[PDB]
Amino acid sequence: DYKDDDDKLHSQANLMRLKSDLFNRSPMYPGPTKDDPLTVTLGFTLQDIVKADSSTNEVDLVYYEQQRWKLNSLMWDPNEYGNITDFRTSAADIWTPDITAYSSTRPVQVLSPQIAVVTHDGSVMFIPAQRLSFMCDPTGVDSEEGATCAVKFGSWVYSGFEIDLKTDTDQVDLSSYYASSKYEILSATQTRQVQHYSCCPEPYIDVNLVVKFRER
Amino acid sequence: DKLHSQANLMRLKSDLFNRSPMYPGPTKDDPLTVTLGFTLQDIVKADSSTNEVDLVYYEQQRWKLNSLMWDPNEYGNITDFRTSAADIWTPDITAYSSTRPVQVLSPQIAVVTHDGSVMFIPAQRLSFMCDPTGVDSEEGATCAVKFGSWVYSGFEIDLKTDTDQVDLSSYYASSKYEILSATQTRQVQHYSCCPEPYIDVNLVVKFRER
Amino acid sequence: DDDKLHSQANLMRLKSDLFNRSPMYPGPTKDDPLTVTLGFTLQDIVKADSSTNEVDLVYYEQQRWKLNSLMWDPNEYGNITDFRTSAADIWTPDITAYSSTRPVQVLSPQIAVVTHDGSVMFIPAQRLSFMCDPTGVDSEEGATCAVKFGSWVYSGFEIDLKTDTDQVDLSSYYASSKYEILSATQTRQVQHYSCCPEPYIDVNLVVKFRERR
Amino acid sequence: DKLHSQANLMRLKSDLFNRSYPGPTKDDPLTVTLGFTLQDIVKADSSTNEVDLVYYEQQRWKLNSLMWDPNEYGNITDFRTSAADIWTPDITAYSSTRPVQVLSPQIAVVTHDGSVMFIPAQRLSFMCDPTGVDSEEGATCAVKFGSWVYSGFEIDLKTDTDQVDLSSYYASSKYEILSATQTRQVQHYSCCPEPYIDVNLVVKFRER
Amino acid sequence: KLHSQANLMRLKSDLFYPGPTKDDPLTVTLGFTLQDIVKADSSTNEVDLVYYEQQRWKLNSLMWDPNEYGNITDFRTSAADIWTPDITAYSSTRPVQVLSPQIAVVTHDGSVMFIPAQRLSFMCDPTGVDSEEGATCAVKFGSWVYSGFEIDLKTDTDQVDLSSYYASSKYEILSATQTRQVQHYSCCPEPYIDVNLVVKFRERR
Ligand SMILES: *[C@@H]1O[C@H](CO)[C@@H](O[C@@H]2O[C@H](CO)[C@@H](O[C@@H]3O[C@H](CO)[C@@H](O)[C@H](O[C@H]4O[C@H](CO)[C@@H](O)[C@H](O)[C@@H]4O)[C@@H]3O)[C@H](O)[C@H]2NC(C)=O)[C@H](O)[C@H]1NC(C)=O
Ligand SMILES: CC1=NCCC[C@@]12CCCCC21OCCO1
Ligand SMILES: CC1=NCCC[C@@]12CCCCC21OCCO1
Ligand SMILES: CC1=NCCC[C@@]12CCCCC21OCCO1
Ligand SMILES: CC1=NCCC[C@@]12CCCCC21OCCO1
Ligand SMILES: CC1=NCCC[C@@]12CCCCC21OCCO1
Ligand SMILES: [Cl-]
Ligand SMILES: [Cl-]
Ligand SMILES: [Cl-]
Ligand SMILES: [Cl-]
Ligand SMILES: [Cl-]
Ligand SMILES: [Cl-]
């Protein structure tokens, strides 16, 4: 009825007003500082080991990388915005963390839309799907124990003083692993590590993705 | 009256994209149904070293927004127009088992109709996860790829097919592979992570060496 | 020197009046349809892949059309009869290959020539991979393949296509190509589709070729 | 003084770019000087008759709109600028088989007399039959370079020498250069009444 | 924590260069961290390296007083936001592929540190890679458009950092040096500066 038509128009206006209030009126987050450190939660969903190249020692993975963080500057009261509790927005509208593979051999290829979900508590969920080529010797992939490779993910430019990394579990999600891959997974772990590098005095944080796999 | 026709279309586009506020995407309060259909043009390549298959197809997408409606009488009886896909909201329909970024083979232009219906038909080359084992036998190989929103649940975007049969009428007659069958089926799925329903369209292709 | 300074001001003034002082052209309509003239200059058959049935062509695609909105009187602008402009500054037709297997690769600058009669000429050089079974390329008869070109989104009611000739220009064909051309034609076709009421127009490029011996 | 030199350069660029070129015309034609430095023949593919070259292409032209009095800007005589801040000529290979790959930063040098020097390093795949590369006499291939859209009436081309600069040629390339020439040509095409100008690069090479 | 964010936002606004000149020349410190020789192609004499290239420079225009900005001593910013040097490989065969985010660290003294991870294909004959002596290849890095009078190049050390070299690479590094060189060309009277990266490598045994 007319009332239903009005409710939907009102709901669109409230979303456009919320996005306007958060992005246009307030300056974009300048990133974390020593005085305001940001925790980023990382989890991997391994979809496929596409290729294991024994001529270059590169292995190609397809995965989804779940990134979660919470900003005060993205908080709202749903009661002020027609009970909107979250919205979908372009990744380019918000700050995102510079989470990088430390041993890639080619630029990562993005396989999903660059859209994130922002929730009224200021929490952000971003899940880029990626194809990655990384440094991996697949010697032993044709064996019962298979091959073992590892790749570290973390901020490229922020130390543990500015960006802390967390995992909810040390188990890579294999519930979406392609059942007819050339490679079967023996195990896949994701482990937070804290290091000191020779160059620098700050602690450095990474999540180490370790995959044991063999030819099916 | 050609000057008037151009003026009427420039006025219509100006009215819709400036003087009317734009759509910000669907919500639980204002859910959107997207209709999807595939026209399979070619299975270009089936790689048994990586279990990747390369498809060329076009994907018909259709949806309807109240904000893209107009009265043709008020605009010299214009009933539709073509516009850049960047001038309008488009759904984030994604292959769930791609192994490479989709390559776009057609112009990013949509057709908008006076009822607010949009039709967008991107032609694509897709590499996806597929074991071609059996492709060199009479019963052939079977592979499947799901398509849906990456970021919207069933509470914001619903999907539909207008038919469950993939359009094979443009399938390349001299492909290295013949199609035994091609289906496109709406599926409702729950994931352990999340409470909301998730909707996809499952493209299932059975094929063999010509 | 003063003359050169005057000629530049006139061109900058013409371009500004045409683009800055005019609302952007919305494309053709059923009431204001456009004819696009297409012609192909085939430079090379670079690759014929029998494992995927893909063939790679290098060609120049000439496109011509005319808009009243790009017309000017040369006498009003220092007797300027034409100018070069970025293809982004003007409307261009969405002429697409219908059976490509990869995005077209652009080999030339995206710049067009506009004449005072409102006519535009645009000649993109392209590498195209398209669906082609090269079986018989190593025989006297050779292989035959075909690719249709037309608007992706406009019907025959908005965009008509024409050719000046049904003969593909082979005068630039690479004399030392792996493949020699037995024939190459470009033919306007009118098609009807069960989906849709209006006629659809394409230009069918048919190439007969064999391995150079 | 370092602050002043920076102030003067910023003011010169604002004066040249933000104070007020639509390209050459029949009434205002431009001469472009081209010179090639051949660094490597990377690949010669006898299965497709494509050859891959790495070279840098020196481009020089002169505009009245780019000239200034150095005395008015702290005696600045030249500056570096992004190639996107200025008009650049649409010099194209006429027989490329793939889009050119740019190997260098897109930055030009502008001098107070209005002269511009722009030296893009490129990898080019072009149409070339390497038949005979495995013999004493070697293979011969050629590629024309010129404006894609401007005739001889708007852009003329010049070389400073007909000798391609080989002083930077990779000493351990798979291919040794027997000769490399760059020759201005006046072309007539049966499509078109205008004269067309190109520089023809002819390379004679063989397997080392 | 609201005060810290406000002060950082204020600093970046206040701060936000036309590049170096003969009168305002710049020094760029380069250091290489070699991670992997991925590929050596004897059919084309092209070798593919993965490395991190550390670039450091100092601008007076990027200086601030930390006391005026709530004791902020540095910040991270998009490389797009600031001037960066046009340091280029002189013998690449393909465009460099960037493997890391284009973000730099700016310090209150006006110093900038930018560390792009890159994959480079460059001109290299790998003959002898399967021998005890291995193969030797070299690639020069420098400004494409600035002479030694506008950009000086230097290294902190002539030893390439190998502490991150992939232990299971197809190729082991026998040595890797990074050496400032001064050169002259017939065209040009002013001196040109490059850092010459020399790598001696061989098949892992
Ligand atoms: C936009 O579209 C609308 C809707 O189609 C259109 O309005 C229509 O115009 C036609 C033509 O004038 C109208 O048709 C007339 O209808 C009346 C009855 O209502 C008849 O008596 C008329 O017949 C006489 O005139 C004809 C010549 O026009 C003769 O051939 C005939 O022998 C009779 O003498 C005639 O058929 C129609 O009624 C309207 N419809 C509506 C809903 O208003 C409009 O013109 C279009 N253009 C624009 C820019 O809006
Ligand atoms: C640049 C960088 N990014 C990832 C982790 C740490 C590292 C990588 C190498 C070790 C130290 C480092 O930090 C500052 C300089 O380099
Ligand atoms: C991101 C996503 N998009 C579409 C399918 C479902 C999936 C894919 C991964 C598993 C579940 C998921 O739903 C919400 C969070 O992620
Ligand atoms: C999309 C499309 N592009 C080229 C011509 C027409 C065609 C080609 C395929 C069938 C008909 C079609 O028209 C509307 C739907 O698709
Ligand atoms: C487009 C083009 N540009 C450079 C001269 C050669 C060529 C290429 C084909 C022959 C003639 C031509 O000149 C104008 C029209 O086309
Ligand atoms: C463009 C260029 N940049 C760096 C040194 C090598 C080179 C390439 C050609 C030789 C000299 C040169 O220096 C300035 C002008 O040209
Ligand atoms: Cl943000
Ligand atoms: Cl810690
Ligand atoms: Cl919209
Ligand atoms: Cl136009
Ligand atoms: Cl200019
Ligand atoms: Cl800066």
Question: What CATH number has the domain bearing residue A102?
Answer: 2.70.170.10
8 Å CB contact of A112 and B150? yes
In short, whether C195's Cβ falls inside 6 Å of ligand 4 is yes
Residue B183 and residue B204 in contact, taking contact as beta carbons nearer than 8 Å:
yes
In one-letter notation, the amino acid at residue A82 is: G
Residue C126 and residue C58 in contact, taking contact as beta carbons nearer than 8 Å:
yes
C201/B32 Cα distance (integer angstroms)? 34
Pairing, β E171-183 against β E192-203: antiparallel
3-state secondary structure of C112: strand
Nearest alpha carbon to residue D54 among E139, B109, E191, B35: E139
How many CB contacts within 8 angstroms connect chain C with chain D?
80
> Which sign, positive or negative, has the C-alpha torsion D76, D78, D83, D87?
positive
Nearest alpha carbon to residue D155 among D74, D87, D73, D82: D87
B126/B102 Cα distance (integer angstroms)? 5
Residue D91 and residue E85 in contact, taking contact as beta carbons nearer than 8 Å:
no
| Angle CA C19–D118–E50, to nearest 5 | 105
> B84: burial class by Cβ within 10 Å (0-12, 13-18, 19+)?
exposed
Structure tokens at B14: 């100006």
Report the DSSP beta bridge partners of residue E106: E75, E112
Structure tokens at B20: 């009317």
Domain count, chain D: 1
D180/D201 Cα distance (integer angstroms)? 7
* Determination technique used: X-ray
- Phi/psi for C21 (5° steps) reads -95, 5
* Contacts E123 to D, Cβ<8 Å: 39-40, 54, 170, 172-173
First-to-final CA distance of chain C: 58
E92/E118 Cα distance (integer angstroms)? 12
D177/D171 Cα distance (integer angstroms)? 10
For C135, other C-beta atoms within 10 Å of its C-beta total 13
8 Å CB contact of B172 and C99? yes
Domain limits at E23? 1-205
* Contacts E95 to D, Cβ<8 Å: 101-103, 123
Residue with tokens 């030339």: C108
| Mutant choice from A157, A159, A206 vs E, greatest count of E C-beta within 10 A | A157
C70/C66 Cα distance (integer angstroms)? 8
Residue C200 and residue C191 in contact, taking contact as beta carbons nearer than 8 Å:
yes
C48/C56 Cα distance (integer angstroms)? 7
State the closest ligand 5 atom to the C-alpha of D189, by its place in the atom list counted from 1: 11
8 Å CB contact of D119 and E144? yes
Probe target for ligand 5 pocket from C42, C82, C123, C170, with the most ligand atoms within 8 Å of CB: C123
- Torsion over CA of E167, E170, E174 and E180, rounded to 10 degrees? -90
E130/C63 Cα distance (integer angstroms)? 55
Half-sphere exposure of C134 (CA within 13 A, CB side): 22
Residue B178 and residue B201 in contact, taking contact as beta carbons nearer than 8 Å:
no
Count of residues in chain B? 210
E48/A131 Cα distance (integer angstroms)? 20
A153/A65 Cα distance (integer angstroms)? 10
- Considering only CB atoms, which residues of chain A are within 8 Å of chain B? 5, 7-9, 11-13, 15-16, 19, 47-48, 50-51, 62, 82, 84, 87-88, 109-113, 115-117, 127, 129, 131, 175, 178, 180-182
- E144 CA to centre of ligand 6 in angstroms: 6
Residue B182 and residue B202 in contact, taking contact as beta carbons nearer than 8 Å:
no
In short, whether E182's Cβ falls inside 6 Å of ligand 6 is no
Residue C168 and residue C128 in contact, taking contact as beta carbons nearer than 8 Å:
no
3-state secondary structure of A169: coil
- Phi/psi for D151 (5° steps) reads -80, 175
In one-letter notation, the amino acid at residue A50 is: V
B15/A117 Cα distance (integer angstroms)? 31
- Phi/psi for B19 (5° steps) reads -70, -20
Strands (E), D22-105: 30-45, 50-62, 78-82, 91-93, 101-102
Contacts of C177 (CB under 8 A, 6+ apart): C44, C45, C212, D49, D127
Residue with tokens 């043709």: B72
Contacts of D56 (CB under 8 A, 6+ apart): D36, D37, D39, D104, D119, D120, D121, D122
E157/E160 Cα distance (integer angstroms)? 8
Pairing, β B123-129 against β B103-104: antiparallel
3-state secondary structure of D103: coil
First-to-final CA distance of chain B: 55
A8/D169 Cα distance (integer angstroms)? 69
SS3 content of chain C, % helix, strand, coil (to 5): 10, 50, 40
Strands (E), C12-93: 34-49, 54-71, 82-86
Count of residues in chain C? 213
Report the DSSP beta bridge partners of residue A207: A153, A192
E194: left (phi over 0), alpha (psi -120 to 50) or beta: beta
Pairing, β B157-160 against β B32-47: parallel
Residue B5 DSSP class = H
Residue A43 and residue A169 in contact, taking contact as beta carbons nearer than 8 Å:
yes
| Angle CA E159–E160–E165, to nearest 5 | 135
8 Å CB contact of C131 and B42? yes
Residue with tokens 């790749």: A151
Structure tokens at C192: 């009807």
3-state secondary structure of A125: strand
Strands (E), chain B: 32-47, 52-69, 80-84, 93-95, 103-104, 109-113, 115-120, 123-129, 141-149, 157-160, 177-189, 198-209
Q: Return the residue of B nearest to A82 by Cα.
A: B29
Q: Do chains C and E touch (3 or more CB pairs under 8 A)?
A: no
Residue D94 and residue E87 in contact, taking contact as beta carbons nearer than 8 Å:
no
Structure tokens at B66: 């109240």
Residue C209 and residue C181 in contact, taking contact as beta carbons nearer than 8 Å:
yes
Structure tokens at A215: 């030819």
- Considering only CB atoms, which residues of chain D are within 8 Å of chain C? 21-23, 25, 27-28, 47-50, 64-65, 90, 92, 95-99, 127-129, 131, 148-150, 154, 190-191
First-to-final CA distance of chain E: 55
- A194 CA to centre of ligand 8 in angstroms: 6
Cα distances from D178 to residues D137, D163, D181, in angstroms, run: 9, 12, 11
Nearest alpha carbon to residue C174 among B103, D142, D207: D142
Structure tokens at E167: 């232990």
Contacts of E67 (CB under 8 A, 6+ apart): none
Binding-site positions of C for Ca(2+) = 171
- E5 CA to centre of ligand 7 in angstroms: 12
Contacts of A216 (CB under 8 A, 6+ apart): A180, A181, A182, A183, A184
Task: Tell me if A10 is assigned to a ligand binding site.
Answer: yes
Structure tokens at B114: 């006076």
Residue A177 DSSP class = -
Cα distances from B180 to residues B46, B202, D160, in angstroms, run: 15, 17, 65
B101/C133 Cα distance (integer angstroms)? 26
D53/B167 Cα distance (integer angstroms)? 45
* Contacts A82 to B, Cβ<8 Å: 29
Structure tokens at B155: 């509470």
Q: Which helix (H) or strand (E) holds A15?
A: helix A2-19
SS3 content of chain D, % helix, strand, coil (to 5): 10, 45, 40
For D82, other C-beta atoms within 10 Å of its C-beta total 11
Structure tokens at C31: 């009431």
C163/A47 Cα distance (integer angstroms)? 50
- Contacts of B among chains (3+ CB pairs under 8 A): A, C
Structure tokens at D93: 């290979």
> Which sign, positive or negative, has the C-alpha torsion C121, C127, C130, C136?
positive
Residue C117 and residue C66 in contact, taking contact as beta carbons nearer than 8 Å:
yes
E162/E173 Cα distance (integer angstroms)? 8
Residue D30 and residue C20 in contact, taking contact as beta carbons nearer than 8 Å:
no
Residue with tokens 């192994």: B99
3-state secondary structure of C92: coil
Structure tokens at D199: 């520089």
In one-letter notation, the amino acid at residue A106 is: R
8 Å CB contact of B3 and C68? yes
> E160: burial class by Cβ within 10 Å (0-12, 13-18, 19+)?
buried
Q: Whose alpha carbon is nearest atom 11 of ligand 3?
A: B191
Nearest alpha carbon to residue A106 among A55, A61, A159: A61
Pairing, β C143-151 against β C95-97: antiparallel
Residue D77 and residue D69 in contact, taking contact as beta carbons nearer than 8 Å:
no
For B204, other C-beta atoms within 10 Å of its C-beta total 15
Pairing, β B198-209 against β E151-154: unpaired
Count of residues in chain D? 208
Residue E139 and residue E122 in contact, taking contact as beta carbons nearer than 8 Å:
yes
Contacts of E48 (CB under 8 A, 6+ apart): E37, E38, E39, E40, E119, E120, E121
E120/E38 Cα distance (integer angstroms)? 10
Q: CA Rg, chain A, in Å?
A: 21
> Which sign, positive or negative, has the C-alpha torsion C82, C84, C86, C91?
positive
In short, whether D155's Cβ falls inside 6 Å of ligand 5 is no
**Residue B48 CA to chain centroid, in angstroms?**
28
- B89 CA to centre of ligand 9 in angstroms: 4
Structure tokens at E2: 């609201």
Contacts of C73 (CB under 8 A, 6+ apart): C116
8 Å CB contact of B21 and A15? no
Residues with CB under 6 A from ligand 3: A 45, 64, 127; B 96, 148, 150, 191, 193-194, 198
B68/C8 Cα distance (integer angstroms)? 43
D49: left (phi over 0), alpha (psi -120 to 50) or beta: left
Residue C97 and residue C147 in contact, taking contact as beta carbons nearer than 8 Å:
yes
B128/A86 Cα distance (integer angstroms)? 32
A213/B16 Cα distance (integer angstroms)? 54
For B137, other C-beta atoms within 10 Å of its C-beta total 10
C8/D30 Cα distance (integer angstroms)? 13
Residue C40 and residue C185 in contact, taking contact as beta carbons nearer than 8 Å:
no
Residue with tokens 């004959």: E125
> C151: burial class by Cβ within 10 Å (0-12, 13-18, 19+)?
buried
Contacts of A97 (CB under 8 A, 6+ apart): A38, A40, A67, A69, A155, A158, A163
In short, whether C179's Cβ falls inside 6 Å of ligand 4 is no
